[PDB]
Write a protein that binds this ligand. Structure first.
Ligand SMILES: Nc1ncnc2c1ncn2[C@@H]1O[C@H](COP(=O)(O)OP(=O)(O)O)[C@@H](O)[C@H]1O
Ligand SMILES: [Mg+2]
Length: 133
């Protein structure tokens, strides 16, 4: 896993995507809103993003994955959405270290963690992290 070090979350995501795009058959796109993410939660969100992308590339057999990062004042929203085959989260969740670790990173930063994956809907991961105005 890449590490952010000096970079903002947005910059880390964009740089990772640049590298991935050269190697992978899925189209990987980002929609990153320009706003300051609190330094304290950036690493956690980057670790979630990397796992979500990894799972999409390996497991979805889709053609496109989108990473979105939006500011909604009281919270930020991180969404990773693919158009692939989907899976049953319940069947996998408790035996799955990747999913369990994303959920734990979210908890550590006080954020919700949701996975919506249905046969015709692909897989969508959403994390809403609180922001203090
Ligand atoms: N985006 C996705 N599309 C389809 N299947 C997925 C996706 N993400 C996870 N899965 C399924 O959930 C399982 C558990 O995910 P994870 O805990 O990350 O395990 P892995 O080590 O296999 O990446 C995967 O093996 C795969 O079957
Ligand atoms: Mg995984």
């Amino acid at each position: 896993g890449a590490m952010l070090k000096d970079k903002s979350l947005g910059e880390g995501i964009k740089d990772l995507v640049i590298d991935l795009q050269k190697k992978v058959p899925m189209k990987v796109v980002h929609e990153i809103q320009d706003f300051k993410v609190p330094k304290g939660i950036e690493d956690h969100l980057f670790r979630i993003t990397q796992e979500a992308i990894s799972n999409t590339l390996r497991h979805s057999n889709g053609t496109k994955v989108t990473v979105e990062l939006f500011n909604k004042d009281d919270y930020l929203l991180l969404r990773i959405q693919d158009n692939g085959k989907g899976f049953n989260v319940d069947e996998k969740l408790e035996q799955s270290y990747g999913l369990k670790n994303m959920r734990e990173r979210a908890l550590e930063i006080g954020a919700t963690f949701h996975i919506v994956s249905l046969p015709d809907s692909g897989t969508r991961i959403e994390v809403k992290a609180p922001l203090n105005k």
